[model samples]
Target chain A: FSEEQLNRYEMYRRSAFPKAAIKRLIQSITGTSVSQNVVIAMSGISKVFVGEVVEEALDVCEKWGEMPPLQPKHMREAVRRLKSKGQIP
Target chain B: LFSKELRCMMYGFGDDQNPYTESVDILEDLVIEFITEMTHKAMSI
Candidate 1:
């Protein structure tokens, strides 16, 4: 998680973001090396996946004005909805 | 995902509008935040 370690993905690292976290998340999701060009190519796809989940959670919070803070349930439901709609693999 | 598969999946529907267009640049930030959360989860394991 050091700068040297993060330098591996320097191309994708942001000044305000910790590179290792991004690196690990990609690995956790894909179970592969971030060094792979193919893996890098899918970065946006993965973000789109997460973005949909967060967006759905926000929508639910809006609908239920007094709802508790967004939780893992929201994430799960979002994932389920996406899967049902064949939006992701 | 193989390289070819990744490329195909990403490029196949290039014409589709991105769902996160409202804040066009927000996704990168969201992705970083999500990754940070996951990293903490992983580290605690």
Candidate 2:
């Protein structure tokens, strides 16, 4: 998708989505490198939504209490949960 | 690919209150597991 299609959300600007880290997760999960734009699109949702998902994952870490690395499965679950809550259209 | 599912789910597909809520906790747990796995991989490399 083009940047026009997946334009960055306001949260996209403030929240950290380290490209190298996201790149590594995408490569590990899909065995390929896709456009960072597409990943950017995924993060285009509300900051609240992205923050909640990351927070949930961090809670799971039980170590540093820092935001955990984003993963495909985490993305999947977060998207679905947000949808169910009628937060994302 | 998975993005397709993300789009579809974001649009409210397969969103039944019963199963959706029931599975949320499960997915949360799975996300945690995946987070740990990814974190460990990064540490090792």
Candidate 3:
């Protein structure tokens, strides 16, 4: 699997999500191109999702448009970005 | 045959509280770790 960018990312952030993740989340939504459902569903994220849950996040992100599709590549990209930023050890 | 043991771990909402309030440092750190792990796994494949 390789890195695949996600669209409509902002809609996926849980309210309780950390500020950094939130920032990235917003960037994810705004920076990338995704489906409208991703925007609608992620708005005001509730307990339905958790931190960077790939499948859940993608689904919610793509909820309005066409069901956001995710893969191991996306997951790897996410983890890579987080880690390179020293989010990980 | 030795049983193959596998354990799945989730960071958010499992063992720690909302990092924004109780432990933001730890929470951020965990996410960081997650990313690093993700990168390593991807490279392996």
Candidate 4:
């Protein structure tokens, strides 16, 4: 998450995620929902996180193997590893 | 719905496949689960 990547992200970023769907997923997944602003905020928040996870998962994939297509297995494993790293906030 | 530039960004990562179209559900599960745990900890400290 360097400023370089961040700037690059903003370059291509524009409503990449679907806000309403993000809300629906949040509501259904937890059944405790946030308001529109929060839901809207989390839309890009999670999408950026997707970027983070993608980067991390790619690292893990390289360590475990090589440039294999990104997989759910890689992502979940990266999630496990990232959780043990430190504070996410 | 995913956008064009967004999909290409996946390619920007040097990967051939797109996570938005291919992994939306699993991504949501992971993200929402993490967010829930995140906010739960948010309340405690």
Q: Pick by lDDT: which candidate is best?
A: 4
Against the reference, the lDDT scores of all candidates come to: 0.44, 0.41, 0.33, 0.61
Question: Whose TM-score is greatest here?
Answer: 4
Query: lDDT per residue, candidate 2, A1-89, as tens digits?
Result: 64422332322334333455545655666566658674564334322343555444334433444333333454456656656877544
Off by more than 4 A, model 1: A1-36, B1-45
lDDT of 4 by residue, B24-45 (tens): 4565566666666655564467
Alpha-carbon lDDT of model 2: 0.41
Off by over 4 Å in 4: A1-12, A25-35, A87-89, B1-14, B19-24, B38-45
- Which one wins by DockQ: 1 or 3? 1
**How many clashing residue pairs, candidate 4?**
0
lDDT tens digits by residue: candidate 3, A5-87: 12122222222333344345444534644444433433223122224443333443354353223333334554555456664
Listed per prediction, chain B TM-scores read 0.48, 0.56, 0.50, 0.52
lDDT of 2 by residue, B1-45 (tens): 122222223222222212233234444344334444544554468
- Tens-digit lDDT string for candidate 4 (A54-76): 67778888898666466777777
Residues B1-45 of candidate 1 have per-residue lDDT tens digits of: 122222222222221122223222243444555555554464468
DockQ of candidate model 2: 0.04
| Deviating ranges (above 4 Å) for candidate 2 | A1-13, A46-48, A52-89, B1-45
Error of 3 at A48 (Å): 10
- Relative to the unseen true structure, what is the C-alpha lDDT of residue B25 in candidate 4, on a scale of 0 to 100? 54
Per DockQ, the best of the predicted structures is 4
Q: Tens-digit lDDT track for model 1 on A28-76?
A: 6656556644334445445455446555655555566624344444445
DockQ of each candidate relative to the true complex: 0.05, 0.04, 0.04, 0.30
Instruction: Report fnat for all candidates as fractions from 0 to 1.
Output: 0.04, 0.00, 0.00, 0.19
- Provide the TM-score of the second chain in candidate 4: 0.52
